[PDB]
Write an enzyme that holds these catalytic residues in place. Structure first.
Site, short mmCIF file in Angstrom:
data_model
loop_
_atom_site.label_atom_id
_atom_site.label_comp_id
_atom_site.label_asym_id
_atom_site.label_seq_id
_atom_site.Cartn_x
_atom_site.Cartn_y
_atom_site.Cartn_z
N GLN A 61 1.29 -0.66 0.12
CA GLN A 61 0.37 0.26 0.11
C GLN A 61 0.72 0.96 -0.04
O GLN A 61 1.70 1.48 1.01
CB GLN A 61 -0.79 -0.11 1.18
CG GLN A 61 -1.93 -1.22 1.05
CD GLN A 61 -2.32 -1.08 3.03
OE1 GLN A 61 -3.03 -0.31 3.46
NE2 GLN A 61 -2.59 -2.32 3.28
N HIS A 142 7.37 13.67 -22.08
CA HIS A 142 8.21 14.42 -22.95
C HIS A 142 9.54 14.11 -21.89
O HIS A 142 9.96 14.35 -24.06
CB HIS A 142 7.95 15.85 -22.15
CG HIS A 142 8.30 16.74 -22.34
ND1 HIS A 142 8.54 18.37 -23.53
CD2 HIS A 142 9.82 16.88 -22.24
CE1 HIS A 142 9.36 18.76 -23.36
NE2 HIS A 142 10.54 17.60 -22.66
N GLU A 143 10.13 14.07 -20.78
CA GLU A 143 11.55 13.46 -21.26
C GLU A 143 11.51 12.49 -21.74
O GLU A 143 12.13 11.87 -22.00
CB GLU A 143 11.19 13.25 -19.32
CG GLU A 143 11.97 14.54 -19.04
CD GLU A 143 12.71 15.99 -19.71
OE1 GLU A 143 14.21 14.96 -20.14
OE2 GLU A 143 12.94 16.99 -19.71
N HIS A 146 12.19 12.06 -25.32
CA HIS A 146 13.51 12.83 -25.51
C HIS A 146 14.42 11.14 -25.66
O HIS A 146 15.57 11.58 -26.96
CB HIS A 146 15.00 14.10 -24.56
CG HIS A 146 14.15 14.82 -24.85
ND1 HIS A 146 13.91 15.62 -25.84
CD2 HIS A 146 13.33 15.96 -23.55
CE1 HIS A 146 13.33 16.75 -25.30
NE2 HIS A 146 13.15 17.06 -23.95
N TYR A 157 20.23 19.03 -30.04
CA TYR A 157 19.47 20.26 -29.04
C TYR A 157 20.20 21.31 -28.60
O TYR A 157 19.95 22.20 -27.81
CB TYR A 157 19.96 19.69 -27.43
CG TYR A 157 18.04 19.88 -26.83
CD1 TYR A 157 17.21 19.16 -26.52
CD2 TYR A 157 18.47 20.58 -25.48
CE1 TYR A 157 16.10 19.90 -25.84
CE2 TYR A 157 17.76 21.21 -24.42
CZ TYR A 157 16.55 20.50 -25.07
OH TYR A 157 15.77 20.81 -23.76
N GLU A 166 12.08 19.26 -28.64
CA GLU A 166 11.51 19.89 -27.31
C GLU A 166 10.15 19.25 -27.91
O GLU A 166 9.43 18.77 -27.28
CB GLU A 166 11.61 21.35 -26.96
CG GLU A 166 12.98 21.63 -26.38
CD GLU A 166 12.78 20.72 -25.41
OE1 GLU A 166 12.44 20.27 -24.69
OE2 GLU A 166 14.06 20.43 -25.02
N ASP A 226 18.71 29.64 -23.52
CA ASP A 226 18.18 27.75 -23.46
C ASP A 226 19.40 27.43 -25.43
O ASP A 226 18.18 27.24 -25.95
CB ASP A 226 16.54 28.94 -24.00
CG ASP A 226 16.03 27.67 -23.64
OD1 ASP A 226 16.05 27.07 -22.67
OD2 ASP A 226 14.73 27.84 -24.36
N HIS A 231 13.90 25.88 -26.04
CA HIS A 231 12.26 25.49 -25.03
C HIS A 231 10.69 26.78 -25.41
O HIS A 231 10.10 27.20 -24.92
CB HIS A 231 12.42 25.98 -24.07
CG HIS A 231 12.89 24.89 -23.02
ND1 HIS A 231 13.91 24.53 -22.79
CD2 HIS A 231 12.24 23.79 -22.55
CE1 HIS A 231 14.64 23.21 -22.08
NE2 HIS A 231 13.62 22.52 -22.57
CA LIG Z 1 3.30 0.85 2.44
ZN LIG Z 2 12.51 18.38 -23.43
ZN LIG Z 3 13.26 20.70 -21.33
#
Ligand SMILES: [Ca+2]
Ligand SMILES: [Zn+2]
Ligand SMILES: [Zn+2]
Ligand SMILES: [Ca+2]
Ligand SMILES: [Ca+2]
Ligand SMILES: [Cl-]
Ligand SMILES: [Cl-]
Ligand SMILES: [Cl-]
Ligand SMILES: [Cl-]
Ligand SMILES: [Zn+2]
Ligand SMILES: [Zn+2]
Ligand SMILES: [Zn+2]
Length: 316
Positions: A61, A142-143, A146, A157, A166, A226, A231
């Site tokens: 749990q 999203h990640e 990549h 990138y 991105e 950036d 981004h």
């Molecule tokens: Ca637990």
């Molecule tokens: Zn990203």
């Molecule tokens: Zn990012």
């Protein structure tokens, strides 16, 4: 580890209950043997060393506050796995059912999450900008996307290729969110960003300008911050993707929407068949047009709609 496949129950970061695939060996581990070569979730214990300890629980749990990030990293890794497998016939991020490993409670007050080349890493946030970032399925996906990109197109990138990189992650992060039917939207990170402020997010795909991001190529960012605006300029492609799926009129250009599944098919084919490390926005348009041509035919509505959407955001 080796053990019996069990099903625990827990609550994630937002307090939502969900069942989770665990493995029993003295303790119940966050090890899901039902997907690929396993989804494994680790406790980093507020350190920066990785991955930390495979997550162990006495009773299967997971309702404690400390559990919540691990529940969501684990569960949303599974959902992301299910999406790419069921929808695109892709077996994990490398196409070979590589194990998906995730560490939560990374560092202290860390306002970020990232794929590091071998695993997912989630901060807990500082409680003001972010709550634990695995609470956002679009951040998780999203990640992980990549990693998909790294193993397919290899988009660089920085500059326009990095903005496409991105955008791809925002597109499939969002499409995983819709596929999971987990409070879906075309915003990014809304579930974990600024718990004090409702109705915001890191960025909007449907209206990038809401947060000051470009929605047309003529407004593209040309600075060096950036990594050349990866981004920032992603909004141009994100708005195109939104228009392809949902339709609309943008800078006077009417786009006939063709839905999310077709958007996903077209862009997954572009990513895996046509894009290369230095693809720019114009080459992405051509890759998307060719992908829609492969799938639906040169005279199809789908092709026409892709062209309308890139026209609308000023990409020739
Ligand atoms: Ca637990
Ligand atoms: Zn990203
Ligand atoms: Zn990012
Ligand atoms: Ca979202
Ligand atoms: Ca918020
Ligand atoms: Cl709009
Ligand atoms: Cl708009
Ligand atoms: Cl619109
Ligand atoms: Cl508009
Ligand atoms: Zn959402
Ligand atoms: Zn518009
Ligand atoms: Zn619009």
């Amino acid at each position: 580890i080796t053990g019996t496949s069990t099903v625990g129950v827990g609550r994630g970061v937002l307090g939502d209950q969900k069942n989770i695939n665990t493995t029993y060996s003295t303790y119940y581990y966050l090890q899901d043997n039902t997907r690929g070569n396993g989804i494994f979730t680790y406790d980093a214990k507020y350190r920066t060393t990785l991955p930390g300890s495979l997550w162990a629980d006495a009773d299967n749990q997971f309702f404690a506050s400390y559990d919540a990030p691990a529940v969501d990293a684990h569960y949303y890794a599974g959902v992301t796995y299910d999406y790419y497998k069921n929808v695109h016939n892709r077996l994990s991020y490398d196409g070979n059912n590589a194990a998906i490993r995730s560490s939560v409670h990374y560092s202290q007050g860390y306002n970020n999450a990232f794929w590091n080349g071998s695993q997912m890493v989630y901060g807990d946030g500082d409680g003001q900008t972010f709550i634990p970032l695995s609470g956002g399925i679009d951040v998780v996906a999203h990640e992980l996307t990549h990693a998909v990109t790294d193993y397919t197109a290899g988009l660089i990138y920085q500059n326009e290729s990095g903005a496409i990189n991105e955008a791809i992650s925002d597109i499939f992060g969002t499409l995983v969110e819709f596929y999971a039917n987990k409070n879906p939207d075309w915003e990014i990170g809304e579930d974990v960003y600024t718990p004090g402020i409702s109705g915001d997010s890191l960025r909007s795909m449907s209206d990038p300008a809401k947060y000051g991001d470009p929605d047309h190529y003529s407004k593209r960012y040309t600075g060096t911050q950036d990594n050349g605006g990866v981004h920032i300029n992603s909004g141009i492609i994100n708005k195109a993707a939104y228009l392809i799926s949902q339709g609309g009129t943008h800078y006077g250009v009417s786009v006939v929407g063709i839905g999310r599944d077709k958007l996903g098919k077209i862009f997954y084919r572009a990513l895996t068949q046509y894009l290369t490390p230095t693809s720019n926005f114009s080459q992405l348009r051509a890759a998307a047009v060719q992908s829609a041509t492969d799938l639906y035919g040169s005279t199809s509505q789908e092709v026409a709609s892709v062209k309308q959407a890139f026209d609308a955001v000023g990409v020739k």
